[PDB]
Structure formats: C-alpha cells, structure tokens
mmCIF file of C-alpha atoms in Angstrom:
data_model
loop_
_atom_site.group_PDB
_atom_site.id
_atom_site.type_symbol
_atom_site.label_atom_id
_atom_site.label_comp_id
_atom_site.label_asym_id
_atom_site.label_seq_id
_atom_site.Cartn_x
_atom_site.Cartn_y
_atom_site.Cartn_z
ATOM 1 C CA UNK E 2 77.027 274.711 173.246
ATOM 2 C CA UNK E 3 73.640 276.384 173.397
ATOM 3 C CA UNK E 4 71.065 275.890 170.627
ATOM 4 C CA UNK E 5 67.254 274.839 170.191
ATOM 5 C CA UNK E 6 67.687 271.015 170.392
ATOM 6 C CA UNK E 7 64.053 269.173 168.810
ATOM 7 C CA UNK E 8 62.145 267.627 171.497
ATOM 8 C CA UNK E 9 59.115 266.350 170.709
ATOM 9 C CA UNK E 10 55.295 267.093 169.527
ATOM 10 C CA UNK E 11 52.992 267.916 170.902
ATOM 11 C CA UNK E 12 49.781 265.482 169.276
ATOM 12 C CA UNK E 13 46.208 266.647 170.131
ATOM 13 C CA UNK E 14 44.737 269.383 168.298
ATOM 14 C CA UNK E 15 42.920 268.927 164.565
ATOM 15 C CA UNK E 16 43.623 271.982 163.042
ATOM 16 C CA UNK E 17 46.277 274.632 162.784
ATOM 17 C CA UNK E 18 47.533 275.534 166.256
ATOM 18 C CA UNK E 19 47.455 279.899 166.018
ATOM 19 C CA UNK E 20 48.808 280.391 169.491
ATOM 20 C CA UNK E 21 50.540 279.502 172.773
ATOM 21 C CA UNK E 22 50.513 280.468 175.837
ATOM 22 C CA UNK E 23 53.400 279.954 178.658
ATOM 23 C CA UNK E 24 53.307 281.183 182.634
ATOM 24 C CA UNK E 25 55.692 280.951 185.375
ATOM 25 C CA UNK E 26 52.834 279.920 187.536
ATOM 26 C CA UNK E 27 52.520 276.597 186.466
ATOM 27 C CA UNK E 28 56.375 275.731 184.451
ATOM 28 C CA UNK E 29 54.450 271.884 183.235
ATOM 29 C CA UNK E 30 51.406 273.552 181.609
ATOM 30 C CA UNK E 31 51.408 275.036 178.195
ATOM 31 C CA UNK E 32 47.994 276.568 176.317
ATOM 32 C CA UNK E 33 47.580 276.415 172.706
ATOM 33 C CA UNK E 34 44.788 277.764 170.884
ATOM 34 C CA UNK E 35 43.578 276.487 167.616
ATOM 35 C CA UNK E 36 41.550 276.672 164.225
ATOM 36 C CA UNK E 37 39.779 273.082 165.552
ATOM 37 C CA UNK E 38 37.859 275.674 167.597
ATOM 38 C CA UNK E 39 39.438 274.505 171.109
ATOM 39 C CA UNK E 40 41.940 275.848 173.721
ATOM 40 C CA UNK E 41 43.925 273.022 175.338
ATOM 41 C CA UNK E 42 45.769 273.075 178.822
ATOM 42 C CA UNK E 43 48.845 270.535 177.995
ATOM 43 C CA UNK E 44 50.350 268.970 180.996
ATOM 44 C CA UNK E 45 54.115 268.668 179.820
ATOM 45 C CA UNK E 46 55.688 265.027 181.027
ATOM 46 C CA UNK E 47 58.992 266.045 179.105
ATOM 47 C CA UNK E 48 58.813 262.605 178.558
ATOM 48 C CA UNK E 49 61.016 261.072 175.347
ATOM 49 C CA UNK E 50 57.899 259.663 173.932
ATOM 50 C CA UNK E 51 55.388 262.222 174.553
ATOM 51 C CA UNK E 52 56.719 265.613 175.640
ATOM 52 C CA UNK E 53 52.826 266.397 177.042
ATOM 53 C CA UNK E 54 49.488 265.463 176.520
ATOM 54 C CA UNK E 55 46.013 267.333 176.522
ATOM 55 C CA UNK E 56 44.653 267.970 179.865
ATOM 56 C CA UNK E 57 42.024 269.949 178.994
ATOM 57 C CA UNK E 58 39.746 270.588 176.263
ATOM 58 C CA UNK E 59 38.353 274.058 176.603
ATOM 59 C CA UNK E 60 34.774 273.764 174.099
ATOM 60 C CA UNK E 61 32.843 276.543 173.434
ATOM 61 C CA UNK E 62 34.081 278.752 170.285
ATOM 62 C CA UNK E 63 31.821 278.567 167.512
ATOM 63 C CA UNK E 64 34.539 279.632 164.705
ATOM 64 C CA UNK E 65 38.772 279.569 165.074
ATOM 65 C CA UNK E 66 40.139 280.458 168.074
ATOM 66 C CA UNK E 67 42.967 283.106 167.071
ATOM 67 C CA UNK E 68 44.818 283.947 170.329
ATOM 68 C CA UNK E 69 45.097 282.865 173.820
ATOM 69 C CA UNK E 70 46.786 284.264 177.401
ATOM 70 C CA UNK E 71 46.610 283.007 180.602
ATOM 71 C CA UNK E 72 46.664 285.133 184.068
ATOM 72 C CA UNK E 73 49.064 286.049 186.165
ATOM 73 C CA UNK E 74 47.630 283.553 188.794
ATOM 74 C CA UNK E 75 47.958 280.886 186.547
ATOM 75 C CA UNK E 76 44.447 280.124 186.984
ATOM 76 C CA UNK E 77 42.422 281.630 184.103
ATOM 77 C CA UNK E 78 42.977 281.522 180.665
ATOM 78 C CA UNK E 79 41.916 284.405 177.897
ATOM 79 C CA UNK E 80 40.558 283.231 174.856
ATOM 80 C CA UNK E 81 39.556 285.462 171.786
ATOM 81 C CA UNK E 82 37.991 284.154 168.505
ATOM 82 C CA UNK E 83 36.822 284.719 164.609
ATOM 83 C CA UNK E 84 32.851 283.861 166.051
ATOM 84 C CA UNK E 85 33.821 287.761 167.476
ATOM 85 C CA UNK E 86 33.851 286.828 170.916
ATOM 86 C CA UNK E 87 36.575 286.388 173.843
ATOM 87 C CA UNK E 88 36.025 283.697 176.712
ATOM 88 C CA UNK E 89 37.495 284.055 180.269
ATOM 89 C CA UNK E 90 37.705 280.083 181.591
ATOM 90 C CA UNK E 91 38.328 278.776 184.803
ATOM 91 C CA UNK E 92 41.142 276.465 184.107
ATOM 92 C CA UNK E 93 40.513 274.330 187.350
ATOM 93 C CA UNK E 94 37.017 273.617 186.268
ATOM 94 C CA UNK E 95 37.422 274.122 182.473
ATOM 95 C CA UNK E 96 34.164 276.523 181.906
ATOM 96 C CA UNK E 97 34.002 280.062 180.770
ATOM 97 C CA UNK E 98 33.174 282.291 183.303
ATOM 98 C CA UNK E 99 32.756 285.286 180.887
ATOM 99 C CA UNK E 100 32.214 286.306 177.297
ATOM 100 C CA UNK E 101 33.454 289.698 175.995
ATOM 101 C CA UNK E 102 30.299 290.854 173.271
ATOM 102 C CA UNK E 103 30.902 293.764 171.396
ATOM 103 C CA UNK E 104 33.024 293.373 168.517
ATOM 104 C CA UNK E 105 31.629 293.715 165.291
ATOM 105 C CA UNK E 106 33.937 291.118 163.274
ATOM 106 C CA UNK E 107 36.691 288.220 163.734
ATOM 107 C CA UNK E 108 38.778 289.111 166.671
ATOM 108 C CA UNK E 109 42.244 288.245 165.812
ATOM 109 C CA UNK E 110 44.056 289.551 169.246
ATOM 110 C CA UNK E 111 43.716 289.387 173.228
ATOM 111 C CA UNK E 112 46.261 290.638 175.435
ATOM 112 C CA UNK E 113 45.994 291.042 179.821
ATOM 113 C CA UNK E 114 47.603 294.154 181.186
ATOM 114 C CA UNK E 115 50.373 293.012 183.461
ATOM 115 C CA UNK E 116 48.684 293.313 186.445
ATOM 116 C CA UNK E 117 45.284 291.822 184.491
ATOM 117 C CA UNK E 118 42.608 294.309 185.317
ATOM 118 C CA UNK E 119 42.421 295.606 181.745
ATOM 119 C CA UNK E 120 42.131 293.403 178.743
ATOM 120 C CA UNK E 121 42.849 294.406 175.260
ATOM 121 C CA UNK E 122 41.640 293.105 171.733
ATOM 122 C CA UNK E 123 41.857 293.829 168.207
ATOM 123 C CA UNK E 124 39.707 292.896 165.573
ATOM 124 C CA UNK E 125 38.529 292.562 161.614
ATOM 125 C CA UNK E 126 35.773 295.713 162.894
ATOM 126 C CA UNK E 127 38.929 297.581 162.838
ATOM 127 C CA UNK E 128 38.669 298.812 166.520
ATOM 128 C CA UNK E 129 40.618 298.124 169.908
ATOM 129 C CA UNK E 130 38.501 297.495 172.474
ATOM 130 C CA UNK E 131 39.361 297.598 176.292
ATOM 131 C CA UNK E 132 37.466 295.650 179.054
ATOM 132 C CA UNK E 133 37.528 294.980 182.266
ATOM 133 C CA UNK E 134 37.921 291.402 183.791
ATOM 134 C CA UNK E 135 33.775 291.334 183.890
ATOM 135 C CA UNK E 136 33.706 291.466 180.636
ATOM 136 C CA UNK E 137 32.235 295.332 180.075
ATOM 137 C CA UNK E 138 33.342 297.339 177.361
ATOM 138 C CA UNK E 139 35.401 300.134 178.337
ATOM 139 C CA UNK E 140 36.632 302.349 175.560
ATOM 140 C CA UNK E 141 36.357 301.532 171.626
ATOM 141 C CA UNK E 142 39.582 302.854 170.220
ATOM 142 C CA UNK E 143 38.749 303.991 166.673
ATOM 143 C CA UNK E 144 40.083 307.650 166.391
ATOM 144 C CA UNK E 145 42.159 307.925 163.752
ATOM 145 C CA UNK E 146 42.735 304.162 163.856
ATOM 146 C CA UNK E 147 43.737 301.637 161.802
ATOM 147 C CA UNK E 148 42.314 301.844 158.695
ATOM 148 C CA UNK E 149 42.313 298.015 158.043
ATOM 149 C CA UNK E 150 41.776 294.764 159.825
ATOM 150 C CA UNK E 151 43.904 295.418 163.250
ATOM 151 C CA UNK E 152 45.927 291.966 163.653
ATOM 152 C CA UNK E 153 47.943 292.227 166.620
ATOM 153 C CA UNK E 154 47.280 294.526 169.927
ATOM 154 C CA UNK E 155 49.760 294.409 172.839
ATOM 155 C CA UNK E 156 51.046 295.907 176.264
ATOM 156 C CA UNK E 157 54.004 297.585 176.995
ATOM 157 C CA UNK E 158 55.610 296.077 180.429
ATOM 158 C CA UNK E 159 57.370 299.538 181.004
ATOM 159 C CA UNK E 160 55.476 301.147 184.001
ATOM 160 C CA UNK E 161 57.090 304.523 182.693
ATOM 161 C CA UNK E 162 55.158 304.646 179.502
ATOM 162 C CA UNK E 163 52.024 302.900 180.075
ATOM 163 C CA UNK E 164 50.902 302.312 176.132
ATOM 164 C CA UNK E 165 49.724 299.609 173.895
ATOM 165 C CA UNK E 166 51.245 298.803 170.654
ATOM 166 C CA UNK E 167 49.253 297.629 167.609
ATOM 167 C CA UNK E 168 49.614 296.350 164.004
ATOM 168 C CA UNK E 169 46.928 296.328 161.318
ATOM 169 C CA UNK E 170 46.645 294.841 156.892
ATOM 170 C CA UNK E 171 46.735 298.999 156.485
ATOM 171 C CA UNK E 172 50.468 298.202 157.049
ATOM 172 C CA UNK E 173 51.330 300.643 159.948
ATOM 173 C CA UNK E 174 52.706 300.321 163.856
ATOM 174 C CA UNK E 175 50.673 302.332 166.343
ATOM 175 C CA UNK E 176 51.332 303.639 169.554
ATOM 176 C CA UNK E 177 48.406 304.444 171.941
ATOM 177 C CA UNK E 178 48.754 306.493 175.280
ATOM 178 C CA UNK E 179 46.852 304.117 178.096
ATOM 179 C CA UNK E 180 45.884 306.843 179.911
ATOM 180 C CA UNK E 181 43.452 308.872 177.337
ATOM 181 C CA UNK E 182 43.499 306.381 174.472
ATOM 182 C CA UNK E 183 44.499 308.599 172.367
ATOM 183 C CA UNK E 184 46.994 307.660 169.646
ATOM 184 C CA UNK E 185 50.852 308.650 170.062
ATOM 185 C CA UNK E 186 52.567 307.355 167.271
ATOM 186 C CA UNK E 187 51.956 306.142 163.890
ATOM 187 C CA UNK E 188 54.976 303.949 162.386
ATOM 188 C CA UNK E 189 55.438 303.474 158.814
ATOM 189 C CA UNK E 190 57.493 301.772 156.723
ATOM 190 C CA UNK E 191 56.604 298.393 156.202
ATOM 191 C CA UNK E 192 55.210 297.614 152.437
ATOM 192 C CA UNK E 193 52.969 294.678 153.086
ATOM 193 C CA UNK E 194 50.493 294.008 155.329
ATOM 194 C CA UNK E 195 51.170 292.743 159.212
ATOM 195 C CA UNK E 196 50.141 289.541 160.709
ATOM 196 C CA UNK E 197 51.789 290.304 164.283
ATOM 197 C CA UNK E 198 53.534 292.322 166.951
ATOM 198 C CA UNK E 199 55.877 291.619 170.043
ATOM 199 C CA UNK E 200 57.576 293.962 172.524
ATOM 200 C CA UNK E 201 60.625 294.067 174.360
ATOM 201 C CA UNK E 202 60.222 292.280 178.194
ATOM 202 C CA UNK E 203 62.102 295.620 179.050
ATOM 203 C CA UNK E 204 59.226 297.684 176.875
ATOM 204 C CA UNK E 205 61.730 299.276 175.006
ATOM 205 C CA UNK E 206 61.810 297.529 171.815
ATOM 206 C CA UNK E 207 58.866 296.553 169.503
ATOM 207 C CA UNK E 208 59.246 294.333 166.641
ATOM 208 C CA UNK E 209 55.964 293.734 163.699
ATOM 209 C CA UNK E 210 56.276 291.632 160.671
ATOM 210 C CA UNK E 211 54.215 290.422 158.070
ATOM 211 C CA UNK E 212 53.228 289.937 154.539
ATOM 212 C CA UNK E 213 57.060 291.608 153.437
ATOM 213 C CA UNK E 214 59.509 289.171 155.009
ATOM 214 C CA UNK E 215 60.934 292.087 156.833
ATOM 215 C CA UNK E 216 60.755 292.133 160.840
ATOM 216 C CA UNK E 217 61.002 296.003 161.769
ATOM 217 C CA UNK E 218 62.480 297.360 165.132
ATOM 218 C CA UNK E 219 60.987 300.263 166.523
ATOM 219 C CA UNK E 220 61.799 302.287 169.981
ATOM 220 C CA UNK E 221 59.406 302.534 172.662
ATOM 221 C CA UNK E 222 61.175 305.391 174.317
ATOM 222 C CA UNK E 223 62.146 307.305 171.556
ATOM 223 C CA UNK E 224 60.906 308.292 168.432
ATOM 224 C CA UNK E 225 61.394 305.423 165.242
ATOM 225 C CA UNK E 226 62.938 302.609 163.890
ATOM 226 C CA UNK E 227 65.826 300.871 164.880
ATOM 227 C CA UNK E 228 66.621 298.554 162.530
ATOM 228 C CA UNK E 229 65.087 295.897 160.119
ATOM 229 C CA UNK E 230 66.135 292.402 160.106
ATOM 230 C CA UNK E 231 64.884 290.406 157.030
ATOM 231 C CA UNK E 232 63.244 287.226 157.515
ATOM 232 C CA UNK E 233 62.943 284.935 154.494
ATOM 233 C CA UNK E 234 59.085 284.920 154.241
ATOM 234 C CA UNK E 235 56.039 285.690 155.306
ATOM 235 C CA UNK E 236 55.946 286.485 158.819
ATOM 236 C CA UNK E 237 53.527 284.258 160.507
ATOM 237 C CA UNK E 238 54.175 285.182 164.543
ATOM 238 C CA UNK E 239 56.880 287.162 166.224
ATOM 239 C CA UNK E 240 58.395 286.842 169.991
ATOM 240 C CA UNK E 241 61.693 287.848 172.274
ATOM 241 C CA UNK E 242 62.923 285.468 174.561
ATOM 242 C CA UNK E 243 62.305 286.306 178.004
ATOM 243 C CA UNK E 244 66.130 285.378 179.329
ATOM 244 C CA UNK E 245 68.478 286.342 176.431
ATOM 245 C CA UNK E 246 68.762 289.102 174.030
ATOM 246 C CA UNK E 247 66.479 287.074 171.005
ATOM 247 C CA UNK E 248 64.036 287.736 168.709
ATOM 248 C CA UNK E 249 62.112 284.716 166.987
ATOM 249 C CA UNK E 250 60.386 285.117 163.388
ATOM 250 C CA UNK E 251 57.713 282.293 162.476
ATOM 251 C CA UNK E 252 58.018 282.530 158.693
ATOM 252 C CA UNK E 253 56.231 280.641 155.966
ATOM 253 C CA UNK E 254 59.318 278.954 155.413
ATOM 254 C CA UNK E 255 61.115 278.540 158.602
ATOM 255 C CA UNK E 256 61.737 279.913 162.723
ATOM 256 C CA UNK E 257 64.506 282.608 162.585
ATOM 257 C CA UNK E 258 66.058 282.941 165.936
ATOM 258 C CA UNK E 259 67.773 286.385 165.750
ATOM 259 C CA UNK E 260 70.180 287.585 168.086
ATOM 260 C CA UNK E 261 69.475 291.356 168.631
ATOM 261 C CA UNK E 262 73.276 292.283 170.004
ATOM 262 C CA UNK E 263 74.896 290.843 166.410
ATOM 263 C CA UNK E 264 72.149 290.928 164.099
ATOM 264 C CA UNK E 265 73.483 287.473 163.326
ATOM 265 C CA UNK E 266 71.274 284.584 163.088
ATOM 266 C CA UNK E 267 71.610 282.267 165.875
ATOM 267 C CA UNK E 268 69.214 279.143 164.661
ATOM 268 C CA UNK E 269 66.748 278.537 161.606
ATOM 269 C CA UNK E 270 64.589 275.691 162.542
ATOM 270 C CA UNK E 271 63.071 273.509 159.641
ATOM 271 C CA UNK E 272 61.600 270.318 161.481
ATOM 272 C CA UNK E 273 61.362 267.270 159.520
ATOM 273 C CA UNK E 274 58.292 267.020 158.273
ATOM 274 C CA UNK E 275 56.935 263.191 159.263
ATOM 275 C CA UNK E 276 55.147 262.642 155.912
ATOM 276 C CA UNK E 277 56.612 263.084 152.417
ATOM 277 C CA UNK E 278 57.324 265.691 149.339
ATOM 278 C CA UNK E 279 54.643 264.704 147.565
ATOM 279 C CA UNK E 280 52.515 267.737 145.690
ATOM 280 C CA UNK E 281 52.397 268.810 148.909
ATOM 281 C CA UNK E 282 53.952 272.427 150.618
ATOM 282 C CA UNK E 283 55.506 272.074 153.620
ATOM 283 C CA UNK E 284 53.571 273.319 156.975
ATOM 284 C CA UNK E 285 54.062 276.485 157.984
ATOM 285 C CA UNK E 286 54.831 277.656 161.625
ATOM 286 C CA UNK E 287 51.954 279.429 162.475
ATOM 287 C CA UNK E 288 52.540 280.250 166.447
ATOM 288 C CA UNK E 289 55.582 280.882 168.921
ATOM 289 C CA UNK E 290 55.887 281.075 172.681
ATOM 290 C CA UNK E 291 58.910 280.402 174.763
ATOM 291 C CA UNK E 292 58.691 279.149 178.510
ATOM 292 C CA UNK E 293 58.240 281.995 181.141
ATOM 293 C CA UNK E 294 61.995 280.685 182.266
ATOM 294 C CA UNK E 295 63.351 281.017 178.474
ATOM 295 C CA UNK E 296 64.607 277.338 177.888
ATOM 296 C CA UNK E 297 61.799 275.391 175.905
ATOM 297 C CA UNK E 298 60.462 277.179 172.688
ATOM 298 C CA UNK E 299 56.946 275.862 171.752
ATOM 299 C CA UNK E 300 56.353 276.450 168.036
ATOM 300 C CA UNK E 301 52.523 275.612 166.601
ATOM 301 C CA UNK E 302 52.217 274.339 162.912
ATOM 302 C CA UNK E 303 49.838 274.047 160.361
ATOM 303 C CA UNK E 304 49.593 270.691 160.291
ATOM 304 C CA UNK E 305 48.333 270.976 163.629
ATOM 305 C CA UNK E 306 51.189 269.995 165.790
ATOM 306 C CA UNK E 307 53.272 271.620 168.567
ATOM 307 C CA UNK E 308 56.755 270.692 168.589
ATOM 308 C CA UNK E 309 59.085 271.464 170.991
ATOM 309 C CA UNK E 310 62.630 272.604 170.928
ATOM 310 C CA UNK E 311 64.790 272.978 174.345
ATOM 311 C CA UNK E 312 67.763 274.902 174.603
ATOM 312 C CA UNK E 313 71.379 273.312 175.118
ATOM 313 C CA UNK E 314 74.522 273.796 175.856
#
C-alpha cells in the first residue's frame, strides 16, 4: 500500500519555514529557509525520535528569507530574501560567498538553471532579474511584464524549449523565451492572485495556484491550459513529485496530493497539531519539497516546523 506515512519534525527554526530545498547530491541533507531570517542545512538521522537536526545555521539576512536552492554539486546553497538581496553560501564553510544587489524590493523567488550558470529571481520591484554565478546583473526583464508583485520565477528542464515560467498578484502565467528574454506567452485565467509556480520534471506541464483555491495546468509545448484541479484553499506552495505522476498543493487548510493520470486525490494531509483548539487557527503549510529520489515529502509550517511524511507501501 503506498501513501505518505507521518514521520517526524523537524524542530529548529523560530519562525515560519517558506521553503525547502532537496538534492540528490547529498540524500541526508535537507535546506529550509525561513521568516527567523536563517537558512539551515538539516542532517537527516531518520531517526524515530528526531528525523534530523540543524547542522548549520546560515546568518546573514537582515529581513525573511523567502526561497532557497542548492547546486547541482551539492555544495552551495542559493538564498534570496525580503532585505532585497540573494546570498550564494559555501555550505562546507557556512559563509556567503556572494550577494546579488540590484533589486529594488522584497525578492520573493530564486531559481538555478539546470546546469547553474544562470540564476533567476523575481521580486516585489516587479522585475526578473538574471545573473550570473558572480553575482552581476545580466538582463532586467520588465517588458511588458508583470504588472504586480512577481511571486514565483522558474526553469523549464526541457532543453528543447529553453524558457522560464513566472507567476505574479496581477494574476497571470508568463512564458519567457531564454534566449532574447522576450516574453512568449501570457496565461490567463486565474481570478485571484498567485503565490507560486512548479513545472513538470519533463518541462511539459506547469501548474500556478494561489489566492483562488484553484491549481491551473498549463502546456509547455503547446499553446494553453490543460486542466484545473481545485484545491480547497488558498494555495500556499505547489510541487510534482520527481518519481510518479503527482502534483502536491500546500493549501491554507491542508497538502493535496493529486494524481495527474486520474485527477483523483491520492492523500490530504492534516497533521495533528501538538497544541490545542483553543481561539487559535490551525498552522498553515507554508512550503513543499520532496526528496530528489521521490520517497520523503518535507512539508514547512507556520508554526515553524518541518514535518516529514515517507512514502509506503
């Protein structure tokens, strides 16, 4: 029988974890980034008691740290931040190595190309910036841009169509053409605004969600939508497994784990909340990332936990 089976937490940060990031390089390390102004490199023990425990405490953001990657070597991780900034660090010696200057307001998105010689951000200044790994500037994508804070800014893996894909509070998709910057595609439909973006790990499928609790599917290859698949609530975070044919929707409420062939719901995840019901709203999942391999789901919260939920059978 396969399903997420609860773990453990994940007990370290002090304020709402709003990312997590997962490599193949190193299966026992996981990197969460959060609104106590840190990154932290977990080691993961798996053990019943703790699952993991902070390794490293990455200090240096002066405001909440929105979104975090880490290389394809495993070795550096890419932070980006509401004091407008992104940090490369070191994760062997735990110091940032660069700082990315140039944007204008909060930056709520950092992405690494796949083979990490481009970086890409998004941010309240309503641009897209791309820079190189030195930390330089290299184009300011504004032309008929979003028109409102840009939340989310991605890569698409397919080596055909060499785009990114972003999502903005003016409540549109867009599709911009790597090679000239220049915008492709403009996807409307949604009614609310959008918090945040995934794509396909075959770069044909890209799903946004948001402020309507509807998670859109859009074609990366061809022109439009797909489908919609309604998520109860707010749409905090958005991700496809890397191994099966899933799509997982952090909502307000709950994790939806949708599987794309039925457009059945496979699991909705609703931890038990270690505290009471008490004048008090449960916390909301506020970040998603599944293991590079595609059996342990990380979910952040924002009562500043990760818990962890490992796939059975």
């Amino acid at each position: 029988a396969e399903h997420l089976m609860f773990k453990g937490n994940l007990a370290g940060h002090n304020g709402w974890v709003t990312a997590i990031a997962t490599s193949s390089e190193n299966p026992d390390m996981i990197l969460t980034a959060s609104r106590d102004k840190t990154v932290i490199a977990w080691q993961l023990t798996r053990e019943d008691n703790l699952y993991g425990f902070p390794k490293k405490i990455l200090h240096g953001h002066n405001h909440f740290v929105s979104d975090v990657a880490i290389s394809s070597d495993g070795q550096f991780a890419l932070s980006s931040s509401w004091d407008h900034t992104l940090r490369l660090w070191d994760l062997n010696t735990g110091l940032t190595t660069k700082k990315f200057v140039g944007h204008t307001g909060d930056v709520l998105s950092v992405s690494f190309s796949a083979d990490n010689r481009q970086i890409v951000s998004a941010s309240r200044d309503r641009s897209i910036k791309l820079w190189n790994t030195l930390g330089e500037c290299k184009f300011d994508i504004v032309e008929d841009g979003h028109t409102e804070w840009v939340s989310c800014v991605r890569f698409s893996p397919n080596p055909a169509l060499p785009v990114i894909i972003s999502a903005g509070w003016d409540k549109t998709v867009k599709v911009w053409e790597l090679s000239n910057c220049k915008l492709k595609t403009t996807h409307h439909g949604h009614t609310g605004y959008l918090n945040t973006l995934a794509v396909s790990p075959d770069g044909s499928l890209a799903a946004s969600g948001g402020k309507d609790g509807i998670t859109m599917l859009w074609d990366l290859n061809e022109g439009k939508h797909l489908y919609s698949l309604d998520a109860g609530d707010v749409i905090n975070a958005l991700v496809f497994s890397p191994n099966r044919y899933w799509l997982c929707a952090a909502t307000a409420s709950s994790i939806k784990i949708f599987d794309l062939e039925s457009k059945s719901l496979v699991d909705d995840l609703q931890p038990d909340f270690d505290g009471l019901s008490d004048k008090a709203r449960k916390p909301e999942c506020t970040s998603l990332a599944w293991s590079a391999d595609g059996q342990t789901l990380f979910a952040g919260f924002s009562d500043n936990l990760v818990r962890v939920w490992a796939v059975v059978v």
